[PDB]
């Protein structure tokens, strides 16, 4: 299991916006977190949230299976990091 | 934890080869596996092995933390799926 932490300072998201190739508006909400990748300290990672989802509250989390998909070359890829409480 | 299975029929690797941009030879060993992504059946996924590593034997495995890295846009990515026995 991957250990993800949302620190007290990371409790908010920011929003970027724009227009798709054929005219549709979009909005993307982004939040930061720390992930332990086995180095001396956890590293900073950007998360893009799914539509209609609030920012994750401070605390410890792990990664949900729905984060992964098989890519166009047949290998596993991350789609979006989706988190669940630890 | 991600459940990965190497079936009896997937006990071998194949090797692809070529030459890098500035002249060096390379060889890549590839093996197939089944990964449970929560659909009705596990899906087929291609793994590229690390240098000097044998094919994983048939059995159940999970994903090692060393499979992940932070990508050039600050989000988590899979580098190569590295497995450890379940």
UniProtKB/Swiss-Prot annotation, chains A, B:
The keyword NADP does not apply. InterPro entries: NA-bd_OB-fold, Phage_M13_G5P_DNA-bd. It comes from the Viruses. The record marks 16, 21, 26, 34, 46 as: Involved in DNA binding. Keywords: DNA replication, DNA-binding. The keyword DNA-binding applies. Signal peptide: none annotated. Coiled coil: none annotated. The record marks 41 as: Involved in DNA binding, and in the dimer-dimer interactions of the protein-ssDNA complex. GO terms for molecular function: single-stranded DNA binding. Disulfide bonds: none annotated. Homodimer. Belongs to the inovirus G5P protein family. Binds to DNA in a highly cooperative manner without pronounced sequence specificity. During synthesis of the single-stranded (progeny) viral DNA, prevents the conversion into the double-stranded replicative form. G5P is displaced by the capsid protein G8P during phage assembly on the inner bacterial membrane. This is DNA-Binding protein G5P. It comes from Enterobacteria phage f1.
